[PDB]
Short mmCIF file of C-alpha atoms and ligand atoms in Angstrom, two decimals:
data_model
loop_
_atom_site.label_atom_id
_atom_site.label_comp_id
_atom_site.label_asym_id
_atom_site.label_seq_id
_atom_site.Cartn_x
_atom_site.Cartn_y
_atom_site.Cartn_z
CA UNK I 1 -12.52 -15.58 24.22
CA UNK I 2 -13.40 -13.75 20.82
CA UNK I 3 -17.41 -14.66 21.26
CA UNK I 4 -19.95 -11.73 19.96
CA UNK I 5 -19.93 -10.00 23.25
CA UNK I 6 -22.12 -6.83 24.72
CA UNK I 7 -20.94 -3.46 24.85
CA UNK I 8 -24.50 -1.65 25.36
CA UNK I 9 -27.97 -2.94 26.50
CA UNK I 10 -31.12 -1.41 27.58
CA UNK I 11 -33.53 -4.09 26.80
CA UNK I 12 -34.88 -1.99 23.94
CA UNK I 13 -31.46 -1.42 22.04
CA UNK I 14 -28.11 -3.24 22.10
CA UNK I 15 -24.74 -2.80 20.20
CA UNK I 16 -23.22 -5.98 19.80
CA UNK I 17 -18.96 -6.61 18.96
CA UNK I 18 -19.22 -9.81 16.59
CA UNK I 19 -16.96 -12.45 17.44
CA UNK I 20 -13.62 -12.79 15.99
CA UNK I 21 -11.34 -15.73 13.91
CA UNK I 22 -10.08 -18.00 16.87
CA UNK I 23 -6.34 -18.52 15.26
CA UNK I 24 -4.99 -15.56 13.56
CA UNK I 25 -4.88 -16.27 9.97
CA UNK I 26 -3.13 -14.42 6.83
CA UNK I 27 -5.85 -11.87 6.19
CA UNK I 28 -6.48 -8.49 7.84
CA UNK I 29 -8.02 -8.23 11.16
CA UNK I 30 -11.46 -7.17 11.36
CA UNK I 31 -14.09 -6.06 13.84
CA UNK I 32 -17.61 -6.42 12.99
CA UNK I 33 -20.71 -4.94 15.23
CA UNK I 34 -24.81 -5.58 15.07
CA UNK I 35 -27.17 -3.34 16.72
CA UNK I 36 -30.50 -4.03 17.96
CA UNK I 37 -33.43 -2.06 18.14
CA UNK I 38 -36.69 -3.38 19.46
CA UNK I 39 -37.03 -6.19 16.56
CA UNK I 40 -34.73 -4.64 13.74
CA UNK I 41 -31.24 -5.06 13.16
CA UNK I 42 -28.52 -2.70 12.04
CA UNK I 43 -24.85 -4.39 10.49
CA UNK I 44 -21.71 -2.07 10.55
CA UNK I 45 -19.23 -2.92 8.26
CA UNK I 46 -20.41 -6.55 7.88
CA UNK I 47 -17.19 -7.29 5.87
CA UNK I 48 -15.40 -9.41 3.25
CA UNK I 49 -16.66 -12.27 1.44
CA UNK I 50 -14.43 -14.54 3.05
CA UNK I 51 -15.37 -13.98 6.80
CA UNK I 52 -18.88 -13.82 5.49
CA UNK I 53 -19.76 -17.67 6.64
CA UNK I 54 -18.29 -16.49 10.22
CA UNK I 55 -20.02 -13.00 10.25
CA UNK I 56 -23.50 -14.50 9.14
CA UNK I 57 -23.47 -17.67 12.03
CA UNK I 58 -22.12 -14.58 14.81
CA UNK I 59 -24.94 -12.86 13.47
CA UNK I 60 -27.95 -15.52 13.08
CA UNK I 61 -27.18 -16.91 16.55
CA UNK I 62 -28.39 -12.99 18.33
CA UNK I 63 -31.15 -12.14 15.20
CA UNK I 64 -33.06 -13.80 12.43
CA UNK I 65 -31.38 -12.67 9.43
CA UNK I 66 -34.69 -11.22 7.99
CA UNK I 67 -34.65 -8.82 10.64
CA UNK I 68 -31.76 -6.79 9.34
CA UNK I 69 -33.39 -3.85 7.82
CA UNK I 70 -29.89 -2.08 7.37
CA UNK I 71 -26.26 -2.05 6.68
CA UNK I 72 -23.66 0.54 7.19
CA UNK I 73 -20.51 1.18 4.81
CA UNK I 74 -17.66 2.96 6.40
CA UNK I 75 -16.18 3.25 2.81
CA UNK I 76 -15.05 1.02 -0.44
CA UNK I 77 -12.42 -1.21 0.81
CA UNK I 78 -12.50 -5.03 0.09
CA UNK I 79 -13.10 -5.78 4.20
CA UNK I 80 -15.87 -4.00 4.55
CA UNK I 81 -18.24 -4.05 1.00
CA UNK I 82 -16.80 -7.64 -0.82
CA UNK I 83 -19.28 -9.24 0.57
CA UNK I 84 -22.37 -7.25 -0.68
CA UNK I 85 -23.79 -9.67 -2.95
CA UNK I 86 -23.70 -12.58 0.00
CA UNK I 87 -25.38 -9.80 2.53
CA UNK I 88 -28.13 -8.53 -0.42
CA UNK I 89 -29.17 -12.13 -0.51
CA UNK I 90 -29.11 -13.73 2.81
CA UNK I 91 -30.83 -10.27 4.03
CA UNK I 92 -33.29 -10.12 1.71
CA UNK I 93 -35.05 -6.95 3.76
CA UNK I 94 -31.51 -4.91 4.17
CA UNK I 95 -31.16 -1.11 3.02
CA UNK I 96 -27.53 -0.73 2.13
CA UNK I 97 -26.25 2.77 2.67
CA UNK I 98 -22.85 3.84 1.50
CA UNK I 99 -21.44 7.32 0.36
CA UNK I 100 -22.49 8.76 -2.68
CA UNK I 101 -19.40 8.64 -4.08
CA UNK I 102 -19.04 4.59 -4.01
CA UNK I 103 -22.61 3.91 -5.09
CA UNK I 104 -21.88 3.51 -8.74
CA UNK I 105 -19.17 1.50 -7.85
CA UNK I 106 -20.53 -1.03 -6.35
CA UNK I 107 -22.34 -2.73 -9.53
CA UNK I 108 -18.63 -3.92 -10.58
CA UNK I 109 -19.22 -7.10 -7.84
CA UNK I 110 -22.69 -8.10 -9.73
CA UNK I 111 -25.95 -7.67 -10.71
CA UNK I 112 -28.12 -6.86 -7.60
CA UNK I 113 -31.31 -4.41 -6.89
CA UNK I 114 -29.57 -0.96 -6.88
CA UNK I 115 -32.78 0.31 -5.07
CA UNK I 116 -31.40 -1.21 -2.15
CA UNK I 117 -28.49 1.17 -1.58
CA UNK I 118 -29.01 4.42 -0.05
CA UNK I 119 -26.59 7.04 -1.19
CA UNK I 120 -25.30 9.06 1.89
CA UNK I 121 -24.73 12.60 1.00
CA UNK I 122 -21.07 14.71 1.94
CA UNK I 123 -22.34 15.67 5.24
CA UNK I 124 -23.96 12.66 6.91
CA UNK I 125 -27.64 11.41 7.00
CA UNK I 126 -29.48 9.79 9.75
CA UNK I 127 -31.21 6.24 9.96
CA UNK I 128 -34.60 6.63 10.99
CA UNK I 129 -35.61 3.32 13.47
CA UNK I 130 -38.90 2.11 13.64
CA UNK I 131 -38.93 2.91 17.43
CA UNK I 132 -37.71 6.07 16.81
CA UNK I 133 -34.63 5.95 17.95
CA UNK I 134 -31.76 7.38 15.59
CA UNK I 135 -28.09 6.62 14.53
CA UNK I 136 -26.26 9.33 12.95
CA UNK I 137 -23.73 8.85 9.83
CA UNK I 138 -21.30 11.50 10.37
CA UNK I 139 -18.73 12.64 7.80
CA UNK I 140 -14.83 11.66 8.13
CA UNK I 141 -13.67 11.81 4.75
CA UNK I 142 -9.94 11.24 4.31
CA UNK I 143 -9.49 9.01 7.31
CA UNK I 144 -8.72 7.22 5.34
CA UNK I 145 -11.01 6.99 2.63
CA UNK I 146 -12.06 10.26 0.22
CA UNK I 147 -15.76 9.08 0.97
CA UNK I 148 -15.89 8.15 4.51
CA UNK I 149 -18.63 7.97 7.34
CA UNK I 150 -18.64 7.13 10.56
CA UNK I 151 -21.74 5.88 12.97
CA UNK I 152 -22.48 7.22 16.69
CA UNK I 153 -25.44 5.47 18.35
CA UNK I 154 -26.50 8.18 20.72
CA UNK I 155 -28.64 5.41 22.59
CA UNK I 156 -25.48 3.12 23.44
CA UNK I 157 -23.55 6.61 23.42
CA UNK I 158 -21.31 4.39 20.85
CA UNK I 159 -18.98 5.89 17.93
CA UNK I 160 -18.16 3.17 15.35
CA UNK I 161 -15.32 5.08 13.72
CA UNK I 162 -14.15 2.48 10.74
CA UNK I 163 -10.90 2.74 10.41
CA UNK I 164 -10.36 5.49 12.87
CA UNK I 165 -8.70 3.80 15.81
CA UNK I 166 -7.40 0.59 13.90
CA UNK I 167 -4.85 -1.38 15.49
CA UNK I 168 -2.60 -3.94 14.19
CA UNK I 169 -1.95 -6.57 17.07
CA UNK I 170 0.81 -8.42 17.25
CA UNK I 171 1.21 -12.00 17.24
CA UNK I 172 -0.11 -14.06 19.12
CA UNK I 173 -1.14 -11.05 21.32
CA UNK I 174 -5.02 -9.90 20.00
CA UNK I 175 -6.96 -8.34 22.71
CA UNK I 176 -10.52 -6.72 22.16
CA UNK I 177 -10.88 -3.66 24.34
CA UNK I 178 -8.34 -1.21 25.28
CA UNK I 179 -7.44 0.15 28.95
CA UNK I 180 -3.95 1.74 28.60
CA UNK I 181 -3.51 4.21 25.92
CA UNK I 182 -0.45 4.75 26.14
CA UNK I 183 0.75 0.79 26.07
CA UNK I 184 -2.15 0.44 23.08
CA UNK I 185 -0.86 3.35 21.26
CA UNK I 186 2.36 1.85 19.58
CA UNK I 187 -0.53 -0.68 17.73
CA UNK I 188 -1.92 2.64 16.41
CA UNK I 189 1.07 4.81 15.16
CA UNK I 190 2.30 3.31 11.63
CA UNK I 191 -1.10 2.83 10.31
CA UNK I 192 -2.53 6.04 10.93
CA UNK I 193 0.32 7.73 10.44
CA UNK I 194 0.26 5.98 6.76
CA UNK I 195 -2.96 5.93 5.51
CA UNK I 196 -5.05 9.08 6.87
CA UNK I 197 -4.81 11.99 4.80
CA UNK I 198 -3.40 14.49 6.67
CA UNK I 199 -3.78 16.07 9.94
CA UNK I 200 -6.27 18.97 8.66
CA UNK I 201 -8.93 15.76 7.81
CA UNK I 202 -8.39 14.22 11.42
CA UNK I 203 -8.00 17.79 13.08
CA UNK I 204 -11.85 18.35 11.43
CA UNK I 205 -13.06 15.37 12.19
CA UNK I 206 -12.10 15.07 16.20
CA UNK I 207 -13.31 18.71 16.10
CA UNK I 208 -16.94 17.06 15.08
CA UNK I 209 -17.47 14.14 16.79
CA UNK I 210 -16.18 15.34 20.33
CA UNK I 211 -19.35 17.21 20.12
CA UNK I 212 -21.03 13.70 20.91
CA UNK I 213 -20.63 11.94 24.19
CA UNK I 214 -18.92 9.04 23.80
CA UNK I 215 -18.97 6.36 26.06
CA UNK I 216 -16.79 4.04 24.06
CA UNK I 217 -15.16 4.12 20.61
CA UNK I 218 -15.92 0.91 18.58
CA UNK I 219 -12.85 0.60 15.29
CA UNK I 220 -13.56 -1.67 12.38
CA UNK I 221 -9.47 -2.45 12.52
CA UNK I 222 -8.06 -3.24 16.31
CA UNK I 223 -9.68 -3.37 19.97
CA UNK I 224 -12.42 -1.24 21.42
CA UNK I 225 -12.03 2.35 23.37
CA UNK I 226 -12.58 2.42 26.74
CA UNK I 227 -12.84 4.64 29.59
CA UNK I 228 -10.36 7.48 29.73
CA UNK I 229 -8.71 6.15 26.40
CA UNK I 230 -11.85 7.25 24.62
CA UNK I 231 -10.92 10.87 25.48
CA UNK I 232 -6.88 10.29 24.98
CA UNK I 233 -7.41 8.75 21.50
CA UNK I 234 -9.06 11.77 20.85
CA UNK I 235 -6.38 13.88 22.20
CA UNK I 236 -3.63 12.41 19.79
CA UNK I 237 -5.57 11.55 16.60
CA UNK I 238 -6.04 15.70 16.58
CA UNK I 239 -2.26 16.03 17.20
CA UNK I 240 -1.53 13.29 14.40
CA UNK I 241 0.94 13.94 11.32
CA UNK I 242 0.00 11.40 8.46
CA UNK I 243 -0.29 11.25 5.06
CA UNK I 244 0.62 13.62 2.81
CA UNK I 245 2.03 15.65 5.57
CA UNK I 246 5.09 13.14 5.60
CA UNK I 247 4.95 13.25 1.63
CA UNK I 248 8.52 13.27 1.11
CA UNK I 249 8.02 9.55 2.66
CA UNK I 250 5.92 8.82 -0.39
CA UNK I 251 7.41 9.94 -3.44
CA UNK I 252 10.40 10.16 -5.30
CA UNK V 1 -17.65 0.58 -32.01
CA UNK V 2 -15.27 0.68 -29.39
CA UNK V 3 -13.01 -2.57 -29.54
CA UNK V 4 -9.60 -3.06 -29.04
CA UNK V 5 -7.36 -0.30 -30.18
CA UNK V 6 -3.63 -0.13 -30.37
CA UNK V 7 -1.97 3.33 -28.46
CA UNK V 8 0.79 2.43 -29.18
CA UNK V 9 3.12 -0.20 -31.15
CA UNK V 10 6.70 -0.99 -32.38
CA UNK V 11 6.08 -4.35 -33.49
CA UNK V 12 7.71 -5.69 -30.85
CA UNK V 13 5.75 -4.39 -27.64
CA UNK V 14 2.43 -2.92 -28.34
CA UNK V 15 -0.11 -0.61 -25.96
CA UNK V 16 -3.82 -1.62 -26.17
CA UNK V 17 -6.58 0.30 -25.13
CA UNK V 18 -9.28 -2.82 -24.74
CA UNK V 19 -12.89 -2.32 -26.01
CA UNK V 20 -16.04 -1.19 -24.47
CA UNK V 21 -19.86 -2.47 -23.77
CA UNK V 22 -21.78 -1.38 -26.32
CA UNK V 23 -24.44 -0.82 -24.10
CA UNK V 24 -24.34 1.64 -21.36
CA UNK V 25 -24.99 0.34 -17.74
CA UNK V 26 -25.48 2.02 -14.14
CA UNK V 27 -21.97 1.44 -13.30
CA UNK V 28 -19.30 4.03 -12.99
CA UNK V 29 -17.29 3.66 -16.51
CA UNK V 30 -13.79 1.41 -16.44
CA UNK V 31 -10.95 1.64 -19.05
CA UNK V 32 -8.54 -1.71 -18.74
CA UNK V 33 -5.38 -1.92 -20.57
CA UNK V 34 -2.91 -4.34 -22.28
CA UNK V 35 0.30 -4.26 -22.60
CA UNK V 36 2.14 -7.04 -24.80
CA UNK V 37 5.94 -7.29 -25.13
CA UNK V 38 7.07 -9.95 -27.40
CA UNK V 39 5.16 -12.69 -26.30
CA UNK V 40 4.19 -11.67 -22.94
CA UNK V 41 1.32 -9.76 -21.62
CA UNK V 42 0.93 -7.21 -18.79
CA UNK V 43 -2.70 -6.18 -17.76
CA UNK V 44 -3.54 -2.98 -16.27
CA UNK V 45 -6.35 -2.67 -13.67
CA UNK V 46 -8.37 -5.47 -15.64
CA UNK V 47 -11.00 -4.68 -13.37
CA UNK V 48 -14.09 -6.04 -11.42
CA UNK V 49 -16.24 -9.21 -11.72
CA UNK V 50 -19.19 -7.62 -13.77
CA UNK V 51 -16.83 -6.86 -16.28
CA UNK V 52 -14.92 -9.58 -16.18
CA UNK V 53 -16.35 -11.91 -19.34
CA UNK V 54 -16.19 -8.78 -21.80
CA UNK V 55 -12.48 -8.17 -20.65
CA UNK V 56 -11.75 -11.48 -20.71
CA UNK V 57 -12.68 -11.95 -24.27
CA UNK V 58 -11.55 -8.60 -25.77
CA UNK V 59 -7.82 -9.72 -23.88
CA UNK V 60 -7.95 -13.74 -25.21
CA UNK V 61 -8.92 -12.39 -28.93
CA UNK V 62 -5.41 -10.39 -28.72
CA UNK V 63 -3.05 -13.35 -26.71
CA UNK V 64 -2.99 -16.38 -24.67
CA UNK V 65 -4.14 -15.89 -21.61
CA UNK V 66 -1.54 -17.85 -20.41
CA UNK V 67 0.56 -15.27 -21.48
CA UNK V 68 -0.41 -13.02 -19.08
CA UNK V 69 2.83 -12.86 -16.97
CA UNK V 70 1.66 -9.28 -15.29
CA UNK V 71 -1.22 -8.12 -13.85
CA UNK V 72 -1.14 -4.85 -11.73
CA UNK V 73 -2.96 -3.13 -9.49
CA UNK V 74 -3.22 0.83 -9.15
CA UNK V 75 -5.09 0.67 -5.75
CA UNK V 76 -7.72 -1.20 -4.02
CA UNK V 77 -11.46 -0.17 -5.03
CA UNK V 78 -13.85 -2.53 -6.42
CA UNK V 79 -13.89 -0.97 -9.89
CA UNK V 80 -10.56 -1.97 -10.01
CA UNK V 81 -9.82 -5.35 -7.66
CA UNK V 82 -12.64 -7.36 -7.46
CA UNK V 83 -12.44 -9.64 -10.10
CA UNK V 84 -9.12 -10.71 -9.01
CA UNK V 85 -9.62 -14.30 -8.20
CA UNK V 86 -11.36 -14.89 -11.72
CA UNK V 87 -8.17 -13.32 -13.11
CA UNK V 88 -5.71 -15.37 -10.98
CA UNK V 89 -7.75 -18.79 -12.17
CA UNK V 90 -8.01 -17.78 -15.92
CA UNK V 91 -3.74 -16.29 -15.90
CA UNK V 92 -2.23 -19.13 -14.45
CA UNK V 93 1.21 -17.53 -14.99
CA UNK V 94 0.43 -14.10 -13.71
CA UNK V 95 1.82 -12.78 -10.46
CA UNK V 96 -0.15 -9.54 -9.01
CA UNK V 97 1.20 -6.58 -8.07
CA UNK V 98 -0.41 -4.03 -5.72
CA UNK V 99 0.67 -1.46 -2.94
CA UNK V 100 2.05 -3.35 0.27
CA UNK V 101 -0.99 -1.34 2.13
CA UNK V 102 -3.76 -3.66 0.36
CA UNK V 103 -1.46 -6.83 0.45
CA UNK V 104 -3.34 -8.25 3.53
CA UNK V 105 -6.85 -6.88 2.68
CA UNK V 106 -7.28 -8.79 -1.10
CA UNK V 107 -7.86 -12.15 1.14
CA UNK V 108 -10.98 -11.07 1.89
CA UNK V 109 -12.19 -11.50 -1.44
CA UNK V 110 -11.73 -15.22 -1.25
CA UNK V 111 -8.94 -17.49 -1.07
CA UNK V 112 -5.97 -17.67 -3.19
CA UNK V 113 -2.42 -19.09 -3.54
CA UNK V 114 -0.96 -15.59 -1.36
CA UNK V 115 2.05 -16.09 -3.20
CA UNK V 116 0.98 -15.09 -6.00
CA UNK V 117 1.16 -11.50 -5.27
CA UNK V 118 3.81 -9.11 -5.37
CA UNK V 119 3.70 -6.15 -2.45
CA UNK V 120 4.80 -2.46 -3.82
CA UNK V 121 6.69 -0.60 -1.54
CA UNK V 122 5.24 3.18 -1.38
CA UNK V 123 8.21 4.34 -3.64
CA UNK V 124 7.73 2.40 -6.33
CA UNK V 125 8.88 -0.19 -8.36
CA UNK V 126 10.17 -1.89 -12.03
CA UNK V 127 8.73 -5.12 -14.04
CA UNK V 128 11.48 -6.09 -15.56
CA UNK V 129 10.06 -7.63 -18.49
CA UNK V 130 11.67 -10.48 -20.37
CA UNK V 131 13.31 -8.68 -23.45
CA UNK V 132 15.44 -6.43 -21.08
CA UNK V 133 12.25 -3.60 -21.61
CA UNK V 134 11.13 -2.27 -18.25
CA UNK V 135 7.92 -0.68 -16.91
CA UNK V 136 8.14 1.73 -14.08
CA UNK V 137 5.06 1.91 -11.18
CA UNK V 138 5.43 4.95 -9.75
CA UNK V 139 4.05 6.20 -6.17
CA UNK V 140 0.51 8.32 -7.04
CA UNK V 141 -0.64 7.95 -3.30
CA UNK V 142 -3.62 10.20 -2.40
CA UNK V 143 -4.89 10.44 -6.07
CA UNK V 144 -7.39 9.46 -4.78
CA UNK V 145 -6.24 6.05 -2.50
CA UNK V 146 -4.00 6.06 0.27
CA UNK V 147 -1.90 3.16 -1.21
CA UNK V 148 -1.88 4.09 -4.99
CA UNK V 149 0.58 3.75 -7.78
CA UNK V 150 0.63 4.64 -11.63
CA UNK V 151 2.86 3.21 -14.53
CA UNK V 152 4.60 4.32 -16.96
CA UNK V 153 5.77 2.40 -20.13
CA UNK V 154 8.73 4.72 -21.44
CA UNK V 155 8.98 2.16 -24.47
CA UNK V 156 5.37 3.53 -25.20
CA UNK V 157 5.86 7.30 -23.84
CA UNK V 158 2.59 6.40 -22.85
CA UNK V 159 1.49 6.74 -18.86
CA UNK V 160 -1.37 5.15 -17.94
CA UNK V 161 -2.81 7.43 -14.74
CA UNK V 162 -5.29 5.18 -12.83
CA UNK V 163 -7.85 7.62 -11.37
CA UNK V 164 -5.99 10.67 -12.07
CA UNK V 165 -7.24 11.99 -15.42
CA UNK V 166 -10.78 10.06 -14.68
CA UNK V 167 -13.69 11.53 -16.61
CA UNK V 168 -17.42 11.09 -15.84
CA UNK V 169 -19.21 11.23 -19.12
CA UNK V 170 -22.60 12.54 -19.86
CA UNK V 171 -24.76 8.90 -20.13
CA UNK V 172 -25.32 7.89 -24.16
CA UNK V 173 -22.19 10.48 -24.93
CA UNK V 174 -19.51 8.29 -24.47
CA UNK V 175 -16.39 8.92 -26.47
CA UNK V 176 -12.74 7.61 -26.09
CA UNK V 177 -10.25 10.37 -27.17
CA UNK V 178 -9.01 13.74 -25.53
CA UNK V 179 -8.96 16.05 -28.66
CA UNK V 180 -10.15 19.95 -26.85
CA UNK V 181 -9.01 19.59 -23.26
CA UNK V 182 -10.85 22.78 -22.32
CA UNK V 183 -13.91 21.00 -23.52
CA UNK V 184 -13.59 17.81 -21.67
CA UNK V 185 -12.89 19.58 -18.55
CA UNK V 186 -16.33 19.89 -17.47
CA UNK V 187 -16.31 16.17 -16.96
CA UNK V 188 -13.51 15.68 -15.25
CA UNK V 189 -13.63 18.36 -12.56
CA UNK V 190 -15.83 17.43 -9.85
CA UNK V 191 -14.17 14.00 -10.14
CA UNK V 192 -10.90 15.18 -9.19
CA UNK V 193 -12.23 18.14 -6.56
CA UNK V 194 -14.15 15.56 -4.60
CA UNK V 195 -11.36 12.22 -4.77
CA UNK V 196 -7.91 13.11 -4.95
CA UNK V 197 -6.64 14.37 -1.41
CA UNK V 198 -4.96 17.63 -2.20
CA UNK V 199 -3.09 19.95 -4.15
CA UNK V 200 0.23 18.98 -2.23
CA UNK V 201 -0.33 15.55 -3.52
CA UNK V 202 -1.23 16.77 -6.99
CA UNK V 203 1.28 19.09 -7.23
CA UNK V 204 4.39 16.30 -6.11
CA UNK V 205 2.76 13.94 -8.43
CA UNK V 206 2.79 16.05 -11.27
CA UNK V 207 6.19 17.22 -11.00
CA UNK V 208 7.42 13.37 -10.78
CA UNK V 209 5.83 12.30 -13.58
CA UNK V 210 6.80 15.48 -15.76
CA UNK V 211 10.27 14.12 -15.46
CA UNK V 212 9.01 11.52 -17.92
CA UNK V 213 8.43 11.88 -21.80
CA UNK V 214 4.31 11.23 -21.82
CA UNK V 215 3.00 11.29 -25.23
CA UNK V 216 -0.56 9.71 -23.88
CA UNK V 217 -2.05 9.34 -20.21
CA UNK V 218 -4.70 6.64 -20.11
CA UNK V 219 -6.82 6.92 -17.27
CA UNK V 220 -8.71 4.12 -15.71
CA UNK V 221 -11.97 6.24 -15.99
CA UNK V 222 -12.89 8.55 -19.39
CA UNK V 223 -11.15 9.26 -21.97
CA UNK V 224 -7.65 8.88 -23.23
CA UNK V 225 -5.65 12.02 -23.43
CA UNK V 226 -3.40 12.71 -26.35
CA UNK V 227 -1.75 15.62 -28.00
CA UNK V 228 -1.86 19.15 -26.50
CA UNK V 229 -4.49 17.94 -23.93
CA UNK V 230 -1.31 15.96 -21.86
CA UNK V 231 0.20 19.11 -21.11
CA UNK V 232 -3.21 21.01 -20.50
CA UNK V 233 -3.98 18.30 -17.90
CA UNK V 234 -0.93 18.09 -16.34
CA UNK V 235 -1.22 21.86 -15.66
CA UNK V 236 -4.57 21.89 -14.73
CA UNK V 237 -3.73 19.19 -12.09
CA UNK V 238 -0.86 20.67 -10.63
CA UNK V 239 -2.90 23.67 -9.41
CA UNK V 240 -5.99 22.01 -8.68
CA UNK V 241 -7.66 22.75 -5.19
CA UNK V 242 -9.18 19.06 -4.11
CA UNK V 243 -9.77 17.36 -0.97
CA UNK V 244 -8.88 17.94 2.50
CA UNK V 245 -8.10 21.74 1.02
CA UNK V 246 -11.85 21.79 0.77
CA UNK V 247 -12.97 19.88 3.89
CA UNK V 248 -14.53 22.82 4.97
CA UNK V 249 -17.70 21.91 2.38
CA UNK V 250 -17.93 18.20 3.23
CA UNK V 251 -18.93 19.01 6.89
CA UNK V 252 -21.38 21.27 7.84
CA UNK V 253 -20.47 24.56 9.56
ZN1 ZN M 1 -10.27 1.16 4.63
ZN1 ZN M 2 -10.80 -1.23 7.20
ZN1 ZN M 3 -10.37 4.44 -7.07
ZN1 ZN M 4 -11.18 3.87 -10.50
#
C-alpha cells in the first residue's frame, strides 16, 4: 500500500495522507497531507528536500501545482521546512506561513521572496479559503518545538498535530492508521517522553484542542488516529511525563 | 570591521571568533566559531547555506580546510544545520557531531556518506583532540531545542553557549563585545523568555556549567560576553522565568 489515500471528502473539500517511501530507508519517517478546497490547495508539512521529488509527483498527480495557494509549518525542523526553496519555486502562487519566531530564520536556506511567508502570531491565526471555509492554526508550543502550531480542519473535523502523536515503527512493520491504542502506544512512549517539554505544555495543549471535535488525528511522525484512539491518545498525552520533567535523565 | 578575531590563544590551540557581513540582511544574526589545535581545526555551528561562502572564506584564510577534523552541531535549526552538505563536500576529513535525536532527521537535507556523523548521547560527550587536549559537549537540552548540547574548551576557559546567551540587536547597531551586561540585557530578554523551555532547565544548566572555569561564553546569536558580564549572565539565567512557566500567555484564555 503507501498510495496518497483519502481520509475526508465532501466533493467541495478533501484532506488527503500523501503516499509514503515503499522500502524503509535510513532517514526519518514522515507523513505528509494536501487539502483541497473547491480549486485551491493547502500542503501541511510538505517536508525535506530529499523526499521533495516524491512529495511533489504524490502531490501533482491529485492538483496542478499552481493551485497551491498555501503551506503550513508545524515548526523549524529539517523534515518539515528544508525543502522551502524547492516548494517557493515549483509553487510559484504558495503563501508560506510559519511561527513568528522561525520567520527570520528561514533566509539561512537562500534567497527567496520573504513576502511570501506569513508570520503566525503566539496564539494561532486562521487561513481564510476562497470558499470560505476556514482552517485554524492553533498554538502547541513545546511539543516539541518552542514555536509550534498545529492545524484542525473543522470541515474534515481533522487535527494535523505535527509531531504530536509521532510514532516510530518498527522494522519492517509500518502501518498508516491506528486501531488499538494500547498495542500502538509502545511506538509512542520514548519519543514523546524525550522530546516534548514537559507535561504542563501537553497538559495545555490537550486542554485546547479537545475543545474541537475530532474525527481523526493526522501526525507528521507515525500512523493516523482513529476511532476511539483519537479520544485515548488524548487521554495519555495529558497524563504524559517528558522532558524536563525527567531532567535528571538529561544532565549531569 | 568585523573579521576574524582571536578569543583566545596559547600558540598552540587558538579560539576564533570568525568575521561578519558587512552589510546587514533580513536574517536573524549567526556567530560561527573556530577552534584550531595544532594543526587541526574544530568548527562550531558553521551555520546555514546563505552564509556559507562568507564562512567559508573567513575559515580557509585562517587553515586548510582539509584540516577541519571537527565540525559540531549544538542542535538542529536551520540557522545552524543547513549548510551541512556544503560543509561535508568542502571538509573532506571532518566527521559531524550532533545530538542522537537529529541523527536520522539531517538526511532530509540531501544525501550524504551517513557515516560521517557522530550521534551525542543526551549526557554528553569529549573530542579528544590529537595533542591529548580535549573539548567537552555538554547536555544544554531545552535551551531552547529538545536535543541540544554546548561546549566547552577548558584549554580556552572559554564556553561557547549556542542559543543560550543569544542577543537580538537593534538593526545598523551591531556590535560584538559584552562590556555593561545590564545594558545589553534589553536585547537579550525576550529571546530567552520566549525560546528556552524553563527555569528548571535554566537553572540545571547553569549550575553544570558553573562547575567550569568560563572566562568568555560565545553565543551563537549576539554578542560575546566577557568580564563581569559572564557572571551577570549566568545569574540572570539561572532565575529566569521562560517557557512552558509562561504558557499561560502563548494561548489565549
Ligand atoms: Zn520536530
Ligand atoms: Zn517532525
Ligand atoms: Zn535554535
Ligand atoms: Zn540559533
Amino acid at each position: 500500500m503507501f498510495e496518497n489515500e483519502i481520509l475526508f471528502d465532501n466533493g467541495q473539500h478533501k484532506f488527503m495522507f500523501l503516499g509514503w517511501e515503499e522500502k524503509e530507508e535510513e532517514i526519518v519517517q514522515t507523513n505528509q497531507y494536501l487539502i483541497l478546497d473547491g480549486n485551491e490547495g493547502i500542503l501541511l508539512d510538505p517536508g525535506g528536500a530529499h523526499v521533495f521529488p516524491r512529495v511533489m509527483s504524490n502531490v501533482a498527480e491529485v492538483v496542478d501545482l499552481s493551485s497551491i495557494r498555501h503551506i503550513f509549518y508545524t515548526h523549524q525542523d529539517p523534515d518539515v521546512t528544508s525543502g522551502i526553496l524547492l516548494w517557493l519555486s515549483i509553487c510559484e502562487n504558495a503563501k508560506i506561513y510559519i511561527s513568528s519566531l522561525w520567520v527570520r530564520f528561514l533566509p539561512h536556506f537562500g534567497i527567496y521572496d520573504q513576502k511570501r511567508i506569513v508570520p503566525i502570531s503566539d496564539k494561532g491565526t486562521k487561513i481564510k479559503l476562497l470558499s470560505g471555509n476556514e482552517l485554524e492554526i492553533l498554538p502547541a508550543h513545546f511539543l516539541h518545538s518552542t514555536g509550534n502550531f498545529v492545524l484542525y480542519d473543522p470541515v474534515a473535523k481533522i487535527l494535523f498535530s505535527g509531531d504530536i502523536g509521532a510514532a516510530v515503527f518498527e522494522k519492517g512493520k509500518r502501518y498508516r492508521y491506528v486501531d488499538d491504542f494500547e498495542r500502538h502506544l509502545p511506538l509512542m512512549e520514548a519519543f514523546h517522553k524525550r522530546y516534548m517539554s514537559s507535561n504542563a505544555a501537553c497538559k495545555k495543549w490537550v486542554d485546547m484542542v479537545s475543545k474541537k471535535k475530532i474525527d481523526m488525528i493526522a501526525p507528521q511522525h507515525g500512523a493516523v488516529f482513529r476511532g476511539e484512539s483519537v479520544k485515548k491518545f488524548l487521554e495519555w498525552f495529558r497524563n504524559l511525563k517528558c522532558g524536563v520533567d525527567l531532567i535528571d535523565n538529561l544532565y549531569s
